[PDB]
Every structure is written in structure tokens, then in C-alpha cells.
Assembly symmetry: D2
């Protein structure tokens, strides 16, 4: 191991299965030395999270639905009693109504708008606020975003609006926690075939488009994103805060399909 998180203790929310971006981050951080606490969303997720948590010599700290303030408080109560401190926090939580991830953005329902904003955006602020006084000087908070916050990606619709709000909240949070040297950053990941991302209409097309048009000519993996997360969670990135870090084979820099790019 590289020892980059030796003796560090961190909390990961959003582990769903062994395809989760959160699982890539967990494997990498654990190999780097971190002891990891995991939450789970509802009893079903629990049976899948438990053997994964055992595999990284971490542990399951409890149920957390981020719309449930009491479940947030309980999780951080557990951490406080068990560790008395928290070195880093990974926010890998996102939700939007899969039915409305298609057609036109203008046709979304209000309930989908409110639910998407609350689960995908406010939850990072709620978690950071509850975590602030537990967090060590020099700590690191990490969330995940997508290029659809910057440019219009079809079928991503209200989630793009939500991710633009998430990236802005990262900057405001970074200013709030900066004097405590707690950094707040986001990885803008390229598309990866996960449970939640499968709900996007025509996701197969989006993957191939990235494979054909991204500079590196391939899509990224949870292990690659995990290594980039390790950098932002470790002291290697101690002067980096408020940053949207693209881990996407360079896709975000292209302004047009290559004329000789193959047709999908």
C-alpha cells in the first residue's frame, strides 16, 4: 500500500453495490490505510453493503436516508461515540425520478424538482453542517458531480440543474470551512454503468459517445475515480478546495464531435 491515508478514519455515504463509484473510492482509500464507516439507505441496501464493508475491514455505521434528519443525527452520534473525530467524508448520493430523465426538461414535475434538489444537493450541506464540529483540522469533504451541470446533456435534465447547484454549494461551503482548513471538493466523473446511472434514458448511447469522442478514447472506471478521490482525500491535495475536478478521460474539453469519429 501507499499509506496515503494511514491512521485516517472516514465516512462514506452512497455505497449501493460493487459497481458504485463509492465502492471504487472505498477500495482505494482502504488500501491507502483508511478505516471506513458506511451508511446504507433502507434494509435492502444493507445486505449488500455489509459484506462489502467487511471486505475493506471497515464497518457499517447505520441506516441513513438524507431526507430523515433523525437518521443523519444518529449516524454522526455513532461516529462520535466510536471515534470522537472524523478525518474525511464522501458524499456519493444522488437521486432523480428516472421516468422524467427523458423527453424535455420543461416538462418535469414540481415534486421531482423538489425531491432532486433535496436529495442531490441539500444533503451535502446538511451532512457537512452536522459533520463540521467532528471534523479534524485539515479534513476533506468530497462529492460527485457531472458535466451535465456545465453543458446540456440530453435526458439528464433536472439532474443537470441540481448538479450546477451542487457545484456552487461546494464553493460556498469551501469558503465557510476554509479557516478550519477543511477542504470541500467535487469530482466531475465521466459516465459509468452504475445502478442509479442506468435510469438515464439512452445511457448506452452516452457511454459510447464518450468512448468515441473523449480525448483518451475510453470511458473511466470506478477504480480510476477511486484513485482520483484518494488524492483529494489525502494530504497530497491540502491546498485544493472549492475545485470541480474532471475525471472523465478529458471529455469536458471537446467542443464538437470529430468528423472521423465513428457513428454510434
Amino acid at each position: 500500500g501507499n499509506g496515503l491515508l494511514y491512521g485516517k478514519r472516514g465516512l462514506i455515504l452512497g455505497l449501493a453495490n460493487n459497481r458504485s463509484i463509492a465502492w471504487g473510492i472505498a477500495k482505494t482509500a482502504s488500501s491507502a490505510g483508511a478505516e471506513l464507516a458506511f451508511t446504507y439507505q433502507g434494509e435492502a441496501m444493507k445486505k449488500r453493503v455489509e459484506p462489502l464493508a467487511e471486505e475493506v475491514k471497515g464497518f457499517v455505521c447505520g441506516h441513513c436516508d438524507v431526507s430523515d434528519s433523525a437518521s443523519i443525527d444518529a449516524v454522526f452520534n455513532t461516529i462520535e461515540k466510536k471515534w470522537g473525530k472524523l478525518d474525511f467524508l464522501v458524499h456519493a448520493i444522488g437521486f432523480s425520478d428516472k421516468e422524467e430523465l427523458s423527453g424535455r426538461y420543461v416538462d418535469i414535475s414540481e415534486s421531482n424538482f423538489m425531491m432532486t434538489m433535496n436529495i442531490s444537493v441539500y444533503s451535502l450541506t446538511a451532512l457537512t453542517k452536522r459533520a463540521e464540529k467532528l471534523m479534524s483540522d485539515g479534513g476533506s469533504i468530497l462529492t460527485l458531480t457531472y458535466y451535465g451541470a456545465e453543458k446540456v446533456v440530453p435526458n439528464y435534465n433536472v439532474m443537470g440543474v441540481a448538479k450546477a447547484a451542487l457545484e456552487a454549494s461546494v464553493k460556498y461551503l469551501a469558503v465557510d470551512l476554509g479557516p478550519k482548513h477543511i477542504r470541500v471538493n467535487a469530482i466531475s466523473a465521466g459516465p459509468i454503468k452504475t445502478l442509479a446511472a442506468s435510469g438515464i434514458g439512452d445511457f448506452r448511447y452516452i457511454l459510447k459517445w464518450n468512448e468515441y469522442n473523449a480525448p483518451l478514447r475510453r470511458t473511466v472506471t470506478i477504480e480510476e475515480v477511486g484513485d482520483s478521490a484518494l488524492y483529494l482525500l489525502s494530504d497530497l491535495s491540502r491546498s485544493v478546495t472549492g475545485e470541480v475536478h474532471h475525471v472523465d478521460s478529458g471529455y469536458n474539453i471537446i467542443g464538437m464531435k470529430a468528423v472521423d469519429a465513428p457513428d454510434i
Copy 2:
């Protein structure tokens, strides 16, 4: 007049008093020949909107609170019956808790976050759903935003997060409706002394900082924002959509305190 909106018909939501940005927009648009309709938020706002509408020979189409879906349906039904089609729409509505626009972003309540996102962001999508039906022949939709959507500005907090979502929704809406040639744009205005803008704490300092450090060495007025709105509402800008247009004396371009 310059005739840039001659014969055009537009709906303005968000006129509150004679210092509103919406009032600068209304005055310029009327002088350019537009027929204007106005909503009002509640009975106390109605008392101020009626004489201002009279001054520009516009008309008041009724009460609209954007948290009340039925009232949105009602004012758009009124406009549809009177005019049939709409040429432009101005969305000058924003709201956030005044007491939390001071102190730390991280300290905001969930209720304030959700209310701000709904009134300041969702409302544009809610209104555009209805307006699209009246703009089959094309049109222009305009909202208002602020540099705190791009960079951290003191005391703007959750409104900065909300305006970042608003600017993104402008681009998603512009993609939705572009094939119908309905354009959707935003003006990123500099700070101006209005009623809503007075709630932001330390506002006097924000104004002076812009006055002393913006390239043009002065803050902007509702009449200047009105003239930029006129461009975006008129056919002059017929190839512009999804744009966030800074009308801020250039403040958004500086990276540090000006030299003098």
C-alpha cells in the same frame, strides 16, 4: 422611440415598485412600442403595480404567487383569452429568507433551502410550461441572475446556489424550446438598490465595492439593465439563446482589487 418592440406583446412577472429591475425593463420596453401585461403577488403589491402599469398603458392580468399553481394557470388563461399569443416573458422573481442572507452558507435551514429553490428557480420552469403554449410562433424569455452564481459573494449564500441552478435551467430550457425558436436568456445584473436587494446584509458595502472596483467605476441602474433587457427581448438578439449576459459595469471580469 426606437421601435424595437413595435407591436410586440409581453408579460412581466415581478414588478414590485418603481425601483424594481422589472420597472426599468417595463419603461424601456414600453418606449420601444411593446404592449405589456403585469402580474402582482398579493393585495399589497397590487396597490403599487396598478399605477405603474397605467403609466406604460399596460394592463394588470391578475394575482400570481408562483407557489400557487392555480394562480399561474389563471393569469396565463387571462392573457391567452385577451391576446391569443405572447411574444416575450420577463421572469423577475426571486426569494430567500432575509435573516439567513448573512452569516454562513453552511448554517442555512432545510426549509429556507427548499423555499428558495422553489420560488427562485422552479418558478421559471413552471411559468415557461404555460408560456410555451402561447409561443408556437417563437418568442423570448428572460430571467435575472447574479455573479454569486459563478463565484462566492458575501451574504448571498443560498441565493448563489439557487442562481447557479437558475442559470443551468436557462440552458436546459433553451435546448428544449430552441427548435420552436423560443429563446431563453438571463441577465447577470450588478447590484442595484431595490426592495428585495435591500434584504442582503452589508449591501452598502457591496455597492461601494462594485463602484470602486468595477471597470466602469460605477454601479448599474434599472434603466441600463432595461436597455440590455430590450436587446434580449427584441428581434435584435434573434440568434442568442442560453446566454448569461453580464450587465454589471464589467465587475465579473476582475480577479482582485483594482489599482486605484
Copy 3:
């Protein structure tokens, strides 16, 4: 007309023929009341600029090649003698080796890099140096840029690097001259079939890609860019400076193929 430039006088550099973006700017500005002066780049351009200037009752103030500082001085002397003051200036000048607007950016030549940077970027600062003396009462300076400054557009290559420097210089000039109320802005135009743009490798493809995928589902014209330029040159935009303004049917906002 709309009168937006009534009583105003401006200088336009970069008119090549009746397809130039500068020609759309000229026609619109003339219809809005502006008195216009034009330069030309050499004898071949002169044969078209002179009668075109006549069609908008404009003034031909002479030859200007922005690589030739003496010729810049002479046109501004000519302007100063005739007018005294200048209300606005249009910089519609760009150049690169068309043979290298293809293949890989990394294969460009050093001489092409330097020539492109000089003609396409430094020229705006050089022209602004002289316009400043004539713009004591304020004014508006406009240049033209392209989305290839922000994101990679294939075959645009060193012109993309150049336009990124241009957009930055617009902002630094805006800080310099803003206290004198001289505004400096750029229009980021969508692709248009002009003499200069036609040398871009696979330019037809870039046009069609924009036609099929821009929000408005069409490319833009010199008359549409001219109307946006009118706004930025007129007092309607008197609180706008340092701005990069997209006139491109919304193309710059998309992140993937349209559906």
C-alpha cells in the same frame, strides 16, 4: 431606422467582401444612423471595399495592414483630421495559415504560431492604442471570437489558442480603459461561410454540425451578428464591458449531440 447610432461615427477594419461579418455589421450600423469609415488590406481588397463603402455612404480612410504599424498610424491620422473623435471601432481581423488548420494542433509551425498571434490578437491591442486618443468622451470597441477558444473544435487548432488570448486581452483592455468609459467586448459568432473561415479544414462539416445540433437548429447570418454588434456598439449596452457574447444559435451550451 431604429436610430441607435444616430450622430455616431465609427471605424471598421476587416471588410473583405459582401459576405464578411464586417459587412453585416456595416449594413446594420449604417441603417441605425452611423457614419462609417473603412480600411482595406491591400489592392485586392480595395477593389471590393471601395464600392461597398459607397453603398453605405461610408468613407474609405485607406490601406491598413496590421503587421505594418506605419499604416495603422496613417489611417488614424486621416480619421483624426476628418472627424476629431471616434465613437466606436470594429476589429474584424483574423489570420492563420490555412494549410495548418487541419491535422493536429501539435504539428503547427512556429512561424504560423507567431503570425497568427500577431495578426489575430496583438492587432486589437495595437489598434486600441490609437483609438484611445480619439475616444476621450468614451466609446465602444468590438472584436470577434469563436467557441474554439473555450473548447476544442477540430481543425481550428492554433486559431483556438489565438482566440483564447484575444478573449483574455478583451478583459485586460476593458479594465485599462473602463475608467475612461471606453468599453471593450467580443461577439463569439457561430460559423459563417466567409473568405477567411472557408480555409478551415472541414468547414462544411462544422457548419452542418451547427445546423443540426444548435438549439435554434440553424446557423447564423452576418445580418444577425450585425444586429448583436449594433447593440454592443450603441448606448443600449452602456453598462456592458469585458463581455464575450455568444451569437451562435445557442451552440456553445450543448454538451453532446442533440436529440
Copy 4:
């Protein structure tokens, strides 16, 4: 050792002294296992580079002035004979007339504009041209930029125009070389007291301003930039290209001084 650059060979251009950003990058890359080669710009620089190179078990591969294309090809000939392949390249080179890093950008001279663009921008493209054949199995190319490319920083002037071109060239190069898995990125560094940066007018004001107004309430060090560079030069960042990575204590995210942040008074 963390071993993140175990067995890797890299070339570093731009080491001037023990305060250079390139020195921080070199110390970190060497600690992580890298075998390093250094150029020097002239004889006065050579006197400082040779002992610094020895300190990191590095090796000096000769004189390079990027306005002299013969010297570029010479050092890449030396590298190709000693090593054959190259894993990473560090471009820590910038220049502009320090007498004009003050007053108004509109008053710059044409020769200063052209010389700044050539040394500070085209040099990255020229170096990458040669490095391409030595990086046939992939690699990582890193340059340094500054937030004055994005927003106006007074007295940075033509250097900000140049850094905007440099950042664009990073993206175009990343597209060119991506298919060969050669990544091209930039670190946007916050201000650091170095030889070159000291030429900026009132650079101490820019430093104090960053200390009070950056989110982390401090300016950055060459060791911190070195650690961020380690990430971009190593396989940990193998899916990252075309990136402008801010290592600036977060300064770039600020849109206005806080109301209660200090108003700096100055004395002569």
C-alpha cells in the same frame, strides 16, 4: 516511500533555484521514486542547477533555451540516448518583460507581446512535439498557469493573455495526444515568492491579498504544488487530461472580499 513514481523517468525544464516551483516538483517526484533529468537556461542558471540536481540523484542533460530550437533538439537527443523512452515532462517555463508588468496592459510593446507568447506559450507546444516520440507508450505532460488567465489581475497584464493561450493549448494538445494516452494538464498555482514571480509589480500586495482572502487563509508552497504535481504526473490521475487544476488555497472561487476582511493599508 509511497512509490507513486517508482521506475519512472521524467524531464524537468525550468529549475532556477531552490525556490522554483520546479524544485518543489523535483523534490516530491524524487521522493516518490522518479529518475529525473534537468535542463538549465544558461551558465548562471547552470551553477545553481547542478548541485540541486545532485541533491535529488538527478542528472543534468544540458543547456536549453526555448527560443533556440537547436538546443531543444539537443537535450532531447541526449535524453533519447540515455533513456530511450520518457514517462513525464514538466514545463515550468514562463517569461515576460518585468518593466511592463505594471501600469496598463494597453501600453505594452509589440516585442514584449511576441516574446511573452513565444517563451511562455509556444515553448510548451515545441517541447511536446519532440517529447512525443519518446512517449510512445503513454505519458504525462504538465505545465503551470495562473488565475490571471481567467480574471484580470492588475500588473499581470500580458502574462494573463499568455496564460489564457497556454491553457487553451493544453486542451488542444490533450485532444491531439489523448489517443496515444499522453495526458496534458496544467496546475493553476497561487502566488509563490519565486525569482520570476518577483518581477510582478506589487507582488507582495498580491501575496497579502491571497493570505487574507483565499478560503484556506494562507498562500501555497512549492512543496504543496509538488504534491499536486505528483498526482498529475503519476498513474493516480490516469483518467485526467485537458485539466486546469487549481492549487491556490481556493482563491479562484472568490467573487468579492468579505465585508469584514482587512482593508490593506500600504506604506512607502
